[PDB]
Every structure is written in C-alpha cells, then in structure tokens.
Amino acid sequence: KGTEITHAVVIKKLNEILQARGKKGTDRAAQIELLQLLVQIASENNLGEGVIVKIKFNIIASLYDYNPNLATYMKPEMWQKCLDCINELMDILFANPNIFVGENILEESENLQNVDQPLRVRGCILTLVERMDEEFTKIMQNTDPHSQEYVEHLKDEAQVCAIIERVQRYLEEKGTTEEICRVYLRRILHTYYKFDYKAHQRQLTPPEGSSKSEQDQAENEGEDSAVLMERLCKYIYAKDRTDRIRTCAILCHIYHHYLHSRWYQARDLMLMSHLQDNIQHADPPVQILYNRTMVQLGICAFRQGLTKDAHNALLDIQSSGRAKELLGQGLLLRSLQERNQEQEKVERRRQVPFHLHINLELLECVYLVSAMLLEIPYMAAHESDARRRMISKQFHHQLRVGERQPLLGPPESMREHVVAASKAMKMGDWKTCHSFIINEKMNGKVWDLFPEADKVRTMLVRKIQEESLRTYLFTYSSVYDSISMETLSDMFELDLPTVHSIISKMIINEELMASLDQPTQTVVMHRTEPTAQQNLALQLAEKLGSLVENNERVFDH
Amino acid sequence: RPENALKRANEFLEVGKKQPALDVLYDVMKSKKHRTWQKIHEPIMLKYLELCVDLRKSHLAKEGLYQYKNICQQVNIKSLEDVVRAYLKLAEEKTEAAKEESQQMVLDIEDLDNIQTPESVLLSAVSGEDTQDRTDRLLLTPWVKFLWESYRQCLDLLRNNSRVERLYHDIAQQAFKFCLQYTRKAEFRKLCDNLRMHLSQIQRHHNQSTAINLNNPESQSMHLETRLVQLDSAISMELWQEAFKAVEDIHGLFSLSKKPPKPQLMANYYNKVSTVFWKSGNALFHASTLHRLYHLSREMRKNLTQDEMQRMSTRVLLATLSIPITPERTDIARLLDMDGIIVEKQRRLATLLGLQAPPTRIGLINDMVRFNVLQYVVPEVKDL
Numbered sequence: 001k002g003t004e005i006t007h008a009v010v011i012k013k014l015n016e017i018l019q020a021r022g023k024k025g026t027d028r029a030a031q032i033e034l035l036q037l038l039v040q041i042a043s044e045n046n047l048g049e050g051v052i053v054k055i056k057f058n059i060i061a062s063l064y065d066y067n068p069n070l071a072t073y074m075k076p077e078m079w080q081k082c083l084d085c086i087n088e089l090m091d092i093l094f095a096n097p098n099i100f101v102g103e104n105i106l107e108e109s110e111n112l113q114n115v116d117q118p119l120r121v122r123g124c125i126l127t128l129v130e131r132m133d134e135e136f137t138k139i140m141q142n143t144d145p146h147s148q149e150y151v152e153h154l155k156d157e158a159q160v161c162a163i164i165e166r167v168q169r170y171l172e173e174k175g176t177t178e179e180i181c182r183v184y185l186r187r188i189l190h191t192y193y194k195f196d197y198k199a200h201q202r203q204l205t206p207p208e209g210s211s212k213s214e215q216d217q218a219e220n221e222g223e224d225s226a227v228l229m230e231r232l233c234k235y236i237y238a239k240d241r242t243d244r245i246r247t248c249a250i251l252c253h254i255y256h257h258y259l260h261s262r263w264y265q266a267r268d269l270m271l272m273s274h275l276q277d278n279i280q281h282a283d284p285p286v287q288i289l290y291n292r293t294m295v296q297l298g299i300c301a302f303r304q305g306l307t308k309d310a311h312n313a314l315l316d317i318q319s320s321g322r323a324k325e326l327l328g329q330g331l332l333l334r335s336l337q338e339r340n341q342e343q344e345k346v347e348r349r350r351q352v353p354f355h356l357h358i359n360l361e362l363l364e365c366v367y368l369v370s371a372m373l374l375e376i377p378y379m380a381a382h383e384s385d386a387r388r389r390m391i392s393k394q395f396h397h398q399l400r401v402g403e404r405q406p407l408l409g410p411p412e413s414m415r416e417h418v419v420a421a422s423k424a425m426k427m428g429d430w431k432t433c434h435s436f437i438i439n440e441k442m443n444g445k446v447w448d449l450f451p452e453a454d455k456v457r458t459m460l461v462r463k464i465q466e467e468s469l470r471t472y473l474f475t476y477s478s479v480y481d482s483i484s485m486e487t488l489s490d491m492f493e494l495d496l497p498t499v500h501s502i503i504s505k506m507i508i509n510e511e512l513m514a515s516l517d518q519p520t521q522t523v524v525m526h527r528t529e530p531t532a533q534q535n536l537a538l539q540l541a542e543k544l545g546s547l548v549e550n551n552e553r554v555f556d557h
Numbered sequence: 558r559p560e561n562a563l564k565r566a567n568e569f570l571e572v573g574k575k576q577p578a579l580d581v582l583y584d585v586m587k588s589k590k591h592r593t594w595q596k597i598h599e600p601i602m603l604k605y606l607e608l609c610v611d612l613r614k615s616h617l618a619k620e621g622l623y624q625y626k627n628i629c630q631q632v633n634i635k636s637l638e639d640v641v642r643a644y645l646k647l648a649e650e651k652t653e654a655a656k657e658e659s660q661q662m663v664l665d666i667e668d669l670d671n672i673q674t675p676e677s678v679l680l681s682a683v684s685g686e687d688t689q690d691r692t693d694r695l696l697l698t699p700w701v702k703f704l705w706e707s708y709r710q711c712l713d714l715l716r717n718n719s720r721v722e723r724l725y726h727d728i729a730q731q732a733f734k735f736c737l738q739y740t741r742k743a744e745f746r747k748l749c750d751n752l753r754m755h756l757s758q759i760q761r762h763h764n765q766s767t768a769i770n771l772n773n774p775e776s777q778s779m780h781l782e783t784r785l786v787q788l789d790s791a792i793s794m795e796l797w798q799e800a801f802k803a804v805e806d807i808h809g810l811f812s813l814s815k816k817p818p819k820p821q822l823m824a825n826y827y828n829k830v831s832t833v834f835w836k837s838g839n840a841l842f843h844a845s846t847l848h849r850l851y852h853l854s855r856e857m858r859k860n861l862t863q864d865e866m867q868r869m870s871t872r873v874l875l876a877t878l879s880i881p882i883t884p885e886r887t888d889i890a891r892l893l894d895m896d897g898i899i900v901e902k903q904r905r906l907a908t909l910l911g912l913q914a915p916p917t918r919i920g921l922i923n924d925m926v927r928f929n930v931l932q933y934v935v936p937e938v939k940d941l
Contacts, residue, residue, distance in 0.1 A: 145685060146685055146686070146690075147690050148690055151680060154676055154680075195678070195679070197678060354683070354685070355679070355683055359684055379890065380889065396894075399890055403888065403890050403891045403894065404891065404894065404898060405793075405794055406899050406902045406906070407793055407794050407797040407798070407838065407839070408793045408794055409834065410793060410837055411792075412790050412793070416792065416793065423888070426890075445684070448681060449681070
C-alpha cells in the first residue's frame with residue numbers, strides 16, 4: 001500500500017507527489033496521507049531520517065497548497081497541525097546537525113547539497129516557517145475584534161515567537177547574513193506593539209530581592225536580547241540598500257525607544273533620521289508605520305506632560321479626517337470620494353489586525369486636552385485686550401461644534417466631556433476641572449491602560465493648576481490694583497517657587513507692565529478698566545483699516 | 558387542503574436538526590399556497606402553521622412580509638394574537654440570552670485568572686473589553702424583529718388598534734430592557750426613526766384623525782421611552798432635538814382638537830422631569846418650563862379639582878425657591894462666535910414651549926410675587 005521495497009521507491013513517490021501537486025484537480029488530502037505514511041514506513045538512520053526531513057519540509061508546503069483549494073486563510077485545525085509539525089521538524093533539525101546533507105563525508109545514500117545547494121536548503125526552512133507567519137497574521141486580521149476566538153488565538157503568538165527563537169539559534173553564519181534583513185523584520189513584528197508592563201517588571205523589581213539565578217538569567221537576558229540585536233542591526237544595515245526595510249525599521253526603533261526606553265532617545269533618533277522624503281517613496285506599509293510611530297510619539301509626549309510637543313506630534317493626524325481609513329475602518333460612502341470596492345478589497349487585506357490597533361477616540365482626547373490647555377489661556381489673554389496673534393482654525397473650531405449647543409448639559413459622549421471640561425476651564429475652578437477629566441476617564445475605562453496613569457494625572461493636575469492661575473490673573477487683571485502671592489499659593493494649592501515661576505514668566509514673555517516683588521511677595525499693576533478695553537479694540541479695528549488701506553496700494557502697483 | 562395540516566403535524570413530530578432546515582424551505586413555499594379568503598378553516602389552519610414558524614424562526618423578514626399582507630383580510634383577532642406572539646418572539650430570546658449571559662459568568666468565576674493574566678493585561682491594553690460572542694449573536698436577532706413590528710405599524714394603518722393598545726406599551730416595556738442591557742445607541746436611532754414614521758402616519762390622514770385619539774398612545778409611548786432614556790443615560794443634544802419636534806406637533810394637535818385635560822396633565826408630569834434636566838443644562842429653559850408647569854397645573858386644579866394640599870404646598874415652595882436662580886454667561890468663545898445664534902434657538906425653543914422669550918431675573922421674581930400662589934406658600938419659606 002506503500003511499496004514494500006527500500007529507498008528508491010520513496011524517492012520516486014516524492015517526485016510523483018511533486019509532479020501530481022502541480023496538476024490542478026489532484027487529491028491533495030491523499031498526498032498528505034501518503035506523505036505521513038512515507039514518514040511511518042521509514043526506518044534507516046541518515047537516509048530514512050533525512051527522507052523524513054525532506055518529506056516534513058513538503059508536508060508544510062502541501063498544507064499551505066491544500067487550504068486555497070477551498071478557503072480561507074488556513075483553517076485553524078490545519079494551522080495548529082502546521083505548528084506541531086514545525087516544532088517536531090525543528091526538534092529533528094536540532095538533533096541532526098547536517099546528517100543527510102552529505103557534505104562529502106557520506107554519499108550513499110545522503111545529500112541535501114545535490115538537487116541542490118545545502119545553504120539554499122537550510123534557508124528554505126525559514127521560508128516554510130514564513131508560511132505559518134503569513135497565515136497567523138491573516139487569521140488575526142480577519143477574526144472579529146470582540147470575539148472570544150480573538151482572545152484565544154492571541155495565546156499562539158508566544159508559540160510562533162518561540163519558533164523564531166528556535167530558528168535564530170539554528171543559524172549558521174552564511175544563512176544569518178542573507179536572512180538577517182527578514183529576521184530583523186520578524187524581531188520587529190514581535191516587538192512593535194509591546195506594552196509597558198514587561199519593561200517595568202525588569203527595570204523596577206528590587207535587585208536585592210529579585211532573581212539571582214541560572215534559569216532567570218537566561219530568560220531575562222533573553223527578553224532584552226531583542227534590544228541587544230536592534231543596536232547591532234542598525235550598524236549591520238549600513239551595509240544594506242533595502243531602504244524600504246531601513247525606513248520601516250527606523251520608525252519601529254523610534255516606537256521602541258519612545259515606549260520601552262526614554263523620551264529623549266525617541267526625539268534624538270527622529271531628529272537624526274529625517275524620513276520625510278523616504279516615506280513618499282517607500283510605499284503604503286511604511287506610511288502606515290509612520291502613522292503608527294507618529295501616534296506613539298504624541299502619546300509618549302503626553303505621558304511626559306509636554307502639551308505643545310504632544311499637540312504638534314499629532315498635528316498631521318488631527319488635521320486629517322481620514323484616520324478611520326488608516327486602521328481599515330473606512331466605509332465606501334462617508335464623504336463622497338471613497339471608491340471603488342474592488343480596490344478596497346486589497347486595502348482591507350493589508351490594514352490592519354485588531355491587536356495592532358491604536359484607539360483614535362483616545363488620540364482625539366490627547367490632542368484636544370493638549371490644545372485646550374494651550375489655547376484657553378491664549379484666548380483669555382487676547383480677548384481681555386492683548387489681541388494680536390489669533391490662529392484661524394485652531395482649538396476654537398473643534399470647541400465650536402459643542403460650544404453652540406443650547407441643549408448640552410450632562411455628557412455621555414467623549415466629545416461632550418471635552419466641552420464640559422472647556423466649560424469648567426472657562427469658569428476656572430481647577431478642582432472642578434480635575435474632577436471632570438479624572439472621574440469620567442476612570443468611569444469610561446481610559447485611565448487603566450497605562451501603569452503611568454497617576455504620573456500623567458499628576459502632570460495634568462499641575463498644568464490645570466498653572467493655567468487656572470494664569471486665566472485667573474488674565475481675567476481679574478481687569479480689576480486688580482495689587483495682588484498678594486500667599487493667597488495665590490494656598491488657593492491654587494502650589495509651592496512658592498512654582499508660583500514665582502508662573503507669575504514671572506507671564507510678566508516676562510507677554511511683556512506686561514506689572515511690578516513684581518519676590519522678597520515682599522506682592523504684585524502691583526493697576527491695569528484696570530472698561531473704557532481702555534474698548535479703546536484697544538477700536539485701535540485694533542483702525543489698525544486693520546490702515547493695513548487694508550496699504551494692502552489695496554500693494555495690489556494696485 | 559387538509560394535507561397542509563397533516564404536513565404541519567408530521568414536520569413537528571419528525572424533527573432532528575436536518576429536518577427544520579427543510580421545514581424553513583417548505584414554509585417559504587407554503588406562504589402562498591391557496592388563493593382563498595379567510596373564513597373558518599383557513600384561520601385555524603394558518604395559525605397552527607404560524608406557531609410552528611415562530612418556533613422554527615425561519616428567516617425573520619420573509620414571514621413578516623407574508624404576515625404584513627395575510628392579516629389584511631379583516632382578521633382582527635389574528636392581528637391581536639400575532640402582537641401577543643410578538644412579545645413572546647422577543648421575550649424568550651432575552652431569556653435565552655440571559656441563560657448564556659449567566660452561564661458564561663459562572664465559568665469565568667470557576668476558571669483561574671493566574672493562568673490567563675498575560676492575555677487579560679493585553680486585552681485591557683488593546684481595549685477589546687469584557688466581551689463575549691454568545692450574548693451578542695443572540696442580541697441581534699430580537700432587534701431585527703423589534704424594528705420589523707414598528708415598520709409594520711406604519712403599514713397596518715387605518716384602524717391599527719391591536720398595535721395602538723398593546724404594541725406601543727410592549728415596545729416601550731421591551732425597550733427599557735434593551736437600553737438597560739446594552740443597545741442604547743440602537744434605541745436612540747429607533748426613537749428618531751419611529752418619530753419619522755409617526756409624523757408620516759399623521760400626514761397620511763388615511764381614514765385616521767385626532768377624534769379617535771390615535772396620536773395619544775403613540776405620543777405617550779414616545780414620551781415615556783424618551784423620558785426614561787434621558788434619565789438613565791444618553792447624549793444630551795439628540796433626545797431634545799427629536800423631543801422638541803414631537804412637542805410642536807402635539808401642541809398643534811391639542812390646539813386644533815381642543816385642549817385635552819388628562820394628556821395636558823401628563824404633559825405637566827413630563828414638564829416636571831424637564832425642569833430638573835433643565836436645572837442641570839439650561840436655567841432659562843428651567844424658568845420658562847417651571848412657569849409653564851405652575852400655570853398649567855393651576856389650570857388643571859381649577860378644571861379638575863385637586864385636594865392634595867400638602868403636596869401642593871411642597872410644590873409651590875419648590876417652585877418659588879427654584880425659579881429665579883439663573884447665572885450669567887461665562888462662555889467666552891461662544892460670545893466671540895456670536896451669542897445671538899444661541900439666543901435665536903433659545904427664543905424659538907421658548908416660543909415652542911409656549912411662553913414667548915426667556916424671562917429675565919427681576920421680572921421673574923416680580924410677577925411670581927403678584928400671583929396668588931404666593932399667599933399659599935409655606936410659613937418658613939414665606940418669611941425666608
């Protein structure tokens with residue numbers, strides 16, 4: 001039922017299976033049965049063992065061949081059988097070290113160097129794992145975002161990553177030099193969506209109490225092996241000219257440096273790299289990587305409390321209405337342009353797995369809170385008669401669609417919270433402003449996401465204390481003759497260095513005519529008035545008469 | 558002929574999961590089998606088939622579309638009975654959902670976090686939430702039926718009493734369960750599209766008028782559903798936008814048909830819910846609604862007699878203390894982008910409410926003092 005004779009018949013049937021496979025209607029399931037039975041009947045060391053390896057190599061290829069005959073992406077039962085078969089093939093390869101390769105020590109019957117090229121055969125083994133790498137990505141792209149299946153199939157990623165570690169420990173310098181460009185990318189695939197907690201566990205668990213130990217100091221060093229390789233690979237890529245991979249890798253390194261290292265290194269590397277010219281010419285996947293890293297840079301800037309840097313780092317994204325399409329969540333009518341469906345079938349098969357998502361609704365909150373903190377003091381200073389720098393289409397426009405609602409009282413929605421926070425910030429009660437931002441983001445499951453939650457809350461608390469004091473001084477400088485600085489310290493719940501720092505910068509960089517005494521803790525100003533404000537508004541209006549009068553002359557001539 | 562009843566007997570006894578798939582194909586075929594007009598045998602024969610079809614749950618829309626035209630042969634009892642089925646069609650789907658909704662949580666308690674914690678942390682970090690398939694797939698199927706019956710009311714037309722009597726109260730009574738469980742966003746759309754259907758029905762006049770009070774159970778349902786959703790949780794703007802358009806129609810209809818005392822009393826009760834919501838969201842709308850509430854309730858006391866002296870005393874003291882409390886405008890960006898557009902909507906919404914322009918702080922105190930309800934105010938509050 002095989003054929004009950006040695007060696008040469010099995011080699012003929014492997015050729016028969018390869019020849020049959022390239023014919024269109026062929027019984028691929030029966031070929032898989034026959035390949036399994038050809039493994040079962042083998043008995044001789046070197047030859048039968050190497051025939052099992054040469055067959056097992058083709059079992060993975062046949063399983064990849066079989067599934068597109070009737071759906072989908074690879075069936076999960078077939079994929080788990082590939083996962084088992086790849087591990088057993090790796091265990092046989094780890095046991096073997098080049099038995100059956102020949103390498104002119106034994107030739108009857110050996111040879112992976114003939115029919116042909118032993119390094120090519122050794123390199124093809126990674127390209128078999130790559131078909132499991134493909135199908136796993138396809139499953140986690142097309143399974144539902146909120147299914148229990150999605151949670152379950154996330155468990156298999158550790159099993160895939162463990163196989164990549166088995167493969168990286170089976171090279172072999174001559175395979176390493178050429179596969180390194182793809183292996184660097186595979187290392188990036190298992191790194192470029194990593195979260196805080198693992199970096200926090202290794203860097204913050206007391207070293208006196210922690211691991212002391214032989215297994216632990218394989219595995220811990222194992223985890224930061226990826227960032228050890230990353231630092232080597234940057235230098236190794238100065239040999240290579242695959243600049244789509246170089247541009248993609250640098251964007252991932254900026255993501256890695258921002259999230260798991262320190263926010264200076266991400267800014268240093270981005271300001272070194274200059275990839276603007278590259279992203280135009282480096283295709284949609286690299287452009288999607290640029291968007292992934294750009295979101296992460298703004299989130300990390302927000303996690304260090306820098307509102308300008310956070311606002312500027314999301315500017316490209318938040319001046320674009322097309323962010324929903326970038327994550328594959330586009331509809332075929334939602335302005336008037338979004339066609340045709342036939343092209344969109346390619347695009348939805350490239351963008352994007354749910355476990356690789358970023359939340360846009362959170363991104364809008366980060367951008368709007370960052371902008372709100374900057375622009376509410378800016379409008380308050382200007383329209384209390386320092387009016388000289390208005391920017392047409394900034395935070396005022398995003399506020400405007402919720403500002404003009406005469407029916408808007410309690411919020412349920414994310415945008416309604418921002419309008420409520422803006423209403424609180426315009427009034428200026430800082431404890432009320434904290435309460436609306438903090439409570440409703442615990443209630444909405446949005447504080448929970450980062451172990452830096454209290455650090456970010458503390459930074460936002462201090463920015464609200466500083467800019468509430470700033471709006472308080474801008475509004476009440478309309479009546480204040482003089483101000484004591486003890487009352488400002490206690491009432492805004494701040495230290496005297498912070499209060500002296502806030503007031504001095506406000507006087508110094510809007511260039512206010514206010515006499516500050518730091519030794520006697522007292523501000524004297526006398527800037528009043530109701531009529532003076534109308535006079536400044538009229539003088540601005542008259543200045544825009546002279547500016548237009550002289551613009552008409554420069555059109556004329 | 559009797560051969561329909563023999564098949565309907567056989568299919569029901571034979572069963573096993575392959576055969577109901579064949580029954581679904583056969584029921585779609587049976588749905589036009591015999592061009593007759595309902596008298597004795599056909600209602601008896603059809604209703605037993607319809608009961609099997611509801612149990613099979615065959616295709617959702619098609620059975621409905623056939624029922625949409627089968628009921629038109631004057632079969633009044635069969636329409637009412639199908640509305641009684643309509644609660645059962647959805648109710649045991651909420652119990653079936655509840656069986657899974659409870660079952661999954663028992664397993665969640667029985668399993669062990671400490672061997673699922675990496676995935677739990679990743680599921681939180683990716684924000685996929687506390688989600689499970691079995692309740693979701695069960696939740697979608699009654700919602701299709703729920704919409705199909707509201708669409709059916711807009712196509713039943715004319716008399717539609719079985720739907721007017723039961724189906725609106727049952728839709729509201731079911732809607733509360735759906736809103737509490739999850740589907741508030743679907744409920745928000747359902748209220749908006751039901752209002753479009755209601756206004757469209759009023760605009761038909763196809764053997765229908767205000768003299769049989771057809772508008773009143775539909776408006777009563779829409780008021781009860783919007784009022785509960787507004788209290789429990791929803792976005793502020795849209796519930797008010799649809800509710801104000803419904804109030805404009807009802808104010809028209811009440812003025813045309815003459816002012817009806819019990820629906821105006823219900824409108825007074827709805828206006829008390831409105832005053833509390835307006836104290837949270839807009840003091841000017843509270844002042845006009847509360848003044849309207851005290852005016853309308855004063856007229857109801859004159860028209861209908863109300864001896865609830867203690868409750869009237871607490872309600873007058875609540876009115877006098879609550880009414881003048883209107884702060885000033887702190888919305889600086891709104892002032893720059895022109896407050897007058899917000900004022901335009903506030904004036905038109907106040908005219909729609911029926912009390913002209915929003916009342917100003919001193920005048921609102923002054924005319925409330927001139928009203929003889931000041932005499933009735935409680936001593937401690939009066940001397941306050």
